[PDB]
Design a protein around this ligand. Sequence first.
Ligand SMILES: Cc1ncc(C[n+]2csc(CCOP(=O)(O)OP(=O)(O)O)c2C)c(NO)n1
Ligand SMILES: Cc1ncc(C[n+]2csc(CCOP(=O)(O)OP(=O)(O)O)c2C)c(NO)n1
Ligand code: SF4
Ligand code: SF4
Ligand code: SF4
Ligand SMILES: [Ca+2]
Ligand SMILES: [Mg+2]
Ligand SMILES: [Mg+2]
Lengths: 117, 1231, 235, 118, 58
Amino acid sequence: DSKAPDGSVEEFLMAQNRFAVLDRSFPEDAKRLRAQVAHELDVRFKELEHMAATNIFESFAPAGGKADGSVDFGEGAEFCTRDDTPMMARPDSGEACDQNRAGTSEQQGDLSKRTKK
Amino acid sequence: GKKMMTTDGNTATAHVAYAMSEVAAIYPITPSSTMGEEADDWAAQGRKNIFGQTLTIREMQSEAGAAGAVHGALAAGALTTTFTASQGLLLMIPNMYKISGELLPGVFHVTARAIAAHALSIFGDHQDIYAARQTGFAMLASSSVQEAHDMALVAHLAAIESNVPFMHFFDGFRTSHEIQKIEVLDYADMASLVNQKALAEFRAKSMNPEHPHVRGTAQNPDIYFQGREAANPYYLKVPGIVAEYMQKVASLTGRSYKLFDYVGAPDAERVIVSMGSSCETIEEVINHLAAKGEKIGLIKVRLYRPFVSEAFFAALPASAKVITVLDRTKEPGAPGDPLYLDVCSAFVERGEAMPKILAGRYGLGSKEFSPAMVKSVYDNMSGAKKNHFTVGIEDDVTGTSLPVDNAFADTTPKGTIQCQFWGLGADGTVGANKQAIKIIGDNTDLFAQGYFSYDSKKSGGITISHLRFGEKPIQSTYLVNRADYVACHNPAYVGIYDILEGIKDGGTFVLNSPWSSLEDMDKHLPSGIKRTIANKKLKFYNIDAVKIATDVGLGGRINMIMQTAFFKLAGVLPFEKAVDLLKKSIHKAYGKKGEKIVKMNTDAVDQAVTSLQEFKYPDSWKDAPAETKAEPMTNEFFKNVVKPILTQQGDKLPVSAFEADGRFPLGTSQFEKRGVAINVPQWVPENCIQCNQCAFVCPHSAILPVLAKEEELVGAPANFTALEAKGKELKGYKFRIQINTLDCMGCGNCADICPPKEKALVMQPLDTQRDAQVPNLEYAARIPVKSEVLPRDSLKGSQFQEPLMEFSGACSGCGETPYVRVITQLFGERMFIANATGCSSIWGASAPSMPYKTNRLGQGPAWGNSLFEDAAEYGFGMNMSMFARRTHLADLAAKALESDASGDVKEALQGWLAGKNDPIKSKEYGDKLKKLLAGQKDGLLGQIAAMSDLYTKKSVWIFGGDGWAYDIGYGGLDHVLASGEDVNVFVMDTEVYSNTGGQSSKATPTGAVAKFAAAGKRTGKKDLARMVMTYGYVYVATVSMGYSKQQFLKVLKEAESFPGPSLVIAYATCINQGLRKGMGKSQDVMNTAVKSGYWPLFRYDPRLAAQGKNPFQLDSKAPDGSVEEFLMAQNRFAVLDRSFPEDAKRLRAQVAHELDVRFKELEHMAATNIFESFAPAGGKADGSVDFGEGAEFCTRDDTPMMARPDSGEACDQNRAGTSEQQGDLSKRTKK
Amino acid sequence: GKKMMTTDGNTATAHVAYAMSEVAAIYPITPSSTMGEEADDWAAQGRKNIFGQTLTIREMQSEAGAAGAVHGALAAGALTTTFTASQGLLLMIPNMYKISGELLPGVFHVTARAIAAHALSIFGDHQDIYAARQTGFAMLASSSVQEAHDMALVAHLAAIESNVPFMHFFDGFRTSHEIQKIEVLDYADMASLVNQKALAEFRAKSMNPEHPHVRGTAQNPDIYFQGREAANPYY
Amino acid sequence: GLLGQIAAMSDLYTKKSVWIFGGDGWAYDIGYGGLDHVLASGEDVNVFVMDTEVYSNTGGQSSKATPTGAVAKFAAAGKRTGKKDLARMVMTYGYVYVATVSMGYSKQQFLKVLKEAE
Amino acid sequence: KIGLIKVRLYRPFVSEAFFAALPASAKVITVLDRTKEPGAPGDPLYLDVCSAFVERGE
Ligand SMILES: Cc1ncc(C[n+]2csc(CCOP(=O)(O)OP(=O)(O)O)c2C)c(NO)n1
Ligand SMILES: Cc1ncc(C[n+]2csc(CCOP(=O)(O)OP(=O)(O)O)c2C)c(NO)n1
Ligand code: SF4
Ligand code: SF4
Ligand code: SF4
Ligand SMILES: [Ca+2]
Ligand SMILES: [Mg+2]
Ligand SMILES: [Mg+2]
């Protein structure tokens, strides 16, 4: 909504004591820092200009869906979804499952094949 | 009306909370998490509250955030609750003053849990609720599952009518996780007790622009004090409102309560005053002892705040000559704990008989408070009468403990059956027990009780169940110590844990094992057990549950067989009804897939009953010869401290055994060697290309690469096969991949990722590998690690470095541990780690197991866990200390340069100064100082000499999960990265609150199913990386091991070396994500996460900007189209698809779209030529200046807030207008 | 030596605090703000503490962030302080249990101020310090401008030797802002009262990769209670 | 009955406008974690930040909103880190309305933003 | 005949040092608390002092 830096930052900064005292006490550092501010806003503005010209933007869904129903992230999982800790214990936990101590499904599968009997 | 139900304190209270509330602002914290999760589940199922509405629940970023939202909802006219504990409650404190200060009817339900001091504890005690005793909240205690339900109802009702917020609390775990058969009220009955007039007034006085007011004013000394006292009338009436509601509820339930209730002998001489679950056990003991003539009693405190002295005396027997107040907390330095102090005040105020009061402390962190301990307390009042004592520990350093005699008789009511079950995590024991509680509770008049103890270990951990059944109410809020029935579901436990401890004579002990024959049984079964089985005439039963299961086809799952064992031999029910009942439940449950799966179970039962016969043992066992002690060599600390704890004997360690500040030594996990993997990798040297990827990938450091020169293999076992080392730099070396079979967890990542098609690593049953590999690893461990042969930060070279974090308690195939492990191979010897609470802190430092260790020189990560919310700040503090102390050192160094110090010293000092912040040089010159200044103890050189542990530059790291980084600690992380200082933050993104139960975090992606996002999270994943990249001066990068190990190392080296803030986000697979083919596919999944475009890798390096180049670099390719398969391969996405196909399709499409847009944006970033210049510093100088010096107008106001020592000078305060306006005006008036 | 000066409670205690600390993590809150600002001005001006160094002061995003930083600096062997009150002290409570729980020589200087309930107040009372009484911090009260200087000194010396963190407190405004002609001590005098061996032990037991340990473990019911009682000899 | 209950809820009939006011210290520092989380919630609320680029009321202390080179308490030689870019940070969500205003430059643009934000 | 006991070290509260400052002739003592804990049977300092007298048991 606004335009490119018009070049008056310096007078803008120097017109405020929060910047001016620095100038009166530490001239060298202050000029560097005021120059740094002019640089920052210069880069920022260019970035804002690019944002305004991009044609790369996320869509947008206001809401809608969910409805009645909820499912536990553990339901129907092939391997244990919770640990053996008191922290993950819940009223409905405690059922047997593959705790990943026997290896992958294919690994277990191939081991079976190799030991058949 | 009424309704019988078997649940725990949590669900029992959430039952009422849901009904009485319109809104809940929530945050998860153990052990209160279950409440919020049940509420969310019920809301989704369509459960209506007393207003016929579904509860409005939202999860906040922290408990501080929840307390604020709670305050908002209440101020805005809606009844509101929240559930919390420990650290969580502390964060609500500020808002509690506001909520009571504004007389709002809020209700907080809390699982009383210990506060972190010398250490963290998720267990139960009152340290947290007592910390809020001065906030103005009313405090009501429930001492049992049944009471939790009743008190939760009283609290809500009283809050509505009194306008005083309530905190309803019950003991963490001891009451919250104990399951009992209790009675609950329908919602309509709860509704009928609500004071409608008061409720209407609540809504009418609430915030609303149609009849507004202003709340939260700022007041001066003239009126604040009066304003604070104006609520007095409300607090004077709450006690009567509470008593009134206990009676109204009692008129519906038949269970009466008082502010303070008395139990025991009417003429008792010795009385206990207690609060919480301890009262149940205290009463059980009273009944027992009193029936023997002892004159004791107990005062149960219900309403702790306001404390009505009158009601307390109304319950005090006039004959009481001695009374002890039990406080479940410790307030260091206080003349006494909370309750004791309150009681003391009641007596001095009464100003009459002074019956001698004693203070006692008990149960910190769910410490057992058994009948024997109650006996101790009672004997104390008639004996020594030690004051300010502790019970439950042996205080051998200060002597404040009461001795405890465990020969005390069982005090459970006549006819109570007590059972104990020892199981292996994931074997289904707990589940079957919980099911057995229901079955029995729903089909008999028996009261049922269950309590479960778990493991700090996440995988292959031990579970021990405590179940009780009886004709009389169960008040035993302590573990079973004299069982009638003991079951050991894992043969391995037989010779490592005291399985039969306390088992009653004639009791029955069932064991799962293949030792069916008297020969095998005598071989594997230890002697002590035989001796015990014999001398107690126990009814021993062996059952090869693994064989039976396999036989009937259950595939080796033993839960159904052991369940049968319980029903048939426990003695709680007659065989007929028992087996009959079990079978009916088999059909009820299961029956999911035809009658096929059913039959297998019915069959399992039938065959279990038949095979279950009393194992007959010879009378010879009565004195079977004691064995030897083939115990390996290990630490004295491990010998005297950690092993005793690992074997469930921690309770016997006296306080003299611990460090006052709670610290633990590094590397105690080295000697655990648990051997819990079912299958471990077997090296096949014929196919090995000597790449070192297997060791790089291991979540536990179970793979040890060996690089030795023939001289080192002289005494190597015959089978220590070693290939000739490949590579021009490793000519004369021999190579070998040694497998640590006992530490391996059997996940399968190494084998799944091994390069050659003809795998060099193949999975095999542990038993087929240990004998050969145990003595092999023990030999390899003695071979010097060749850290100098290859570049430390190269893929192959890093595995030739000592890993400083091994054998942690992480799950098998954990996606976080591989990352930290290599990080330590790169900076381990000089790092500080400020670890956020979460999985990384639980596998990282759960006493007594400490995975982080020191290298050969004794150097290693200085590790610490402050809180969950402050990890970044904690690290920033470590950074500040280093800055100040090393600046001091530099100062001392510079002074020494200008002294007559020798030429060499000066040369070294000058070298150090020039390389102070460089890892290489600071160490190089620092090491010379250590040598040159050795022994020096006077003057400058002496001061410098004493600072050698500050010589080489340190590496400060902040470790944390996504929950910490994107939610609760985000504000802190943001501020610390913005400080521009040299710290390194490493975020292990599991896209969920893993540790606490898989709750949704802002790092959780669109459509992922997690707690509080059970229909698929409806907002996209928070982009933490792009947010901190807006600073321009912070190094930001994302990694994914499975995709590229080289980029990971590159990022590690770049982030650490960056002389400013670094943020690294790694994709970490987790069991909560439910990888369909096992966690052994983690590396593959990480790989796909990147290739699919889901988790793009990049690096934002500010020093490139400093040198005219683009700071942003893309490290991965555009989306390859595999998202759908990537997502569908994880249960967190697939469960949604099976339950809500439409939405699931939509959510997965959105995800594809989000990642597509994001990559495009990352592409333009990498192609941009618009970037800010960078400067690590430049300037400073000595001198300050105030913002108001020399200003033309006043720069500060007339407020007490801006007043400073130097203010008060006259200035133009802008009431005369502008400089020109004043000028022009002066001109226009001239005169 | 001794030196007569006219100042208020705030700067009288900051005089001591500056001298006795190496690090300070702060956040501004009335009426304690003056202390941190004085400390920052003096360091920027190059004033030396008893170690001949300028104070390392950083401003955090809140008092919770300040308390976390303080915990970290102490854990890493640096004498550290902070200035706070009211709502600010409340956010420090979690870390206070940690700081005392790990027996660190921290020192908090607070201008005791009213807590916000029915209304907010920047004025003085003990509602805030009483709210942190169970955290395990020793608590030393100064009832006058002259006492603030003296108790602040005692608090620092005692925390170093005892390993128990201290909270030195005085009334908001009534003492923090009252000015009086008092006597202060030179920094050399303060340095001479310091227990050198206790200070050295504090450095040597601090976090450092050269000689690591782990702190902040998670503990089960078997040992937590014993661990909480182990600190008794210190108290 | 029903009509009665509906009648008693007339102060809820018209849609309300929920506003959160706060300075830069609150938004960029102490309350940022909360602000970030609430904006990410997706709910209908409006936050208005009055940026003075300093903690004004308590005495002029620096905040992350303080710009490079500005003198303020704890920035007594000029702040040596630049202004935190709060705006670009919350603009990364994509579903949050974000705007900056300055009355003196344009009163019209300020009004338009109010209308669009609300 | 009146007096005042000034407390310097509030925590740890040392009863022994408290009593060393209390005149044996004291017949009435009032504890002034500069706070308000709603519902408490008394404010902090008061409660600490009451505890000192009960333990002394004289
Ligand atoms: C003040 C506070 N609120 C809540 C909690 C509980 N808590 C501890 S760890 C955790 C989840 C951590 O998630 P994450 O950060 O993503 O790491 P992880 O997934 O476990 O690896 C929670 C909710 C704590 N615990 O001191 N402290
Ligand atoms: C927990 C806490 N509370 C209060 C304060 C003190 N405080 C109040 S307002 C403020 C600065 C506000 O700055 P800002 O947000 O930029 O608004 P303003 O500039 O005055 O308009 C501080 C440091 C620090 N009052 O509850 N910490
Ligand atoms: S199976 Fe897993 S735990 Fe075992 S060595 Fe391989 S990567 Fe490590
Ligand atoms: S991953 Fe396979 S080829 Fe590579 S070092 Fe390990 S065993 Fe050898
Ligand atoms: S991050 Fe997941 S896989 Fe790793 S220890 Fe935690 S719960 Fe287990
Ligand atoms: Ca860095
Ligand atoms: Mg996580
Ligand atoms: Mg401001």
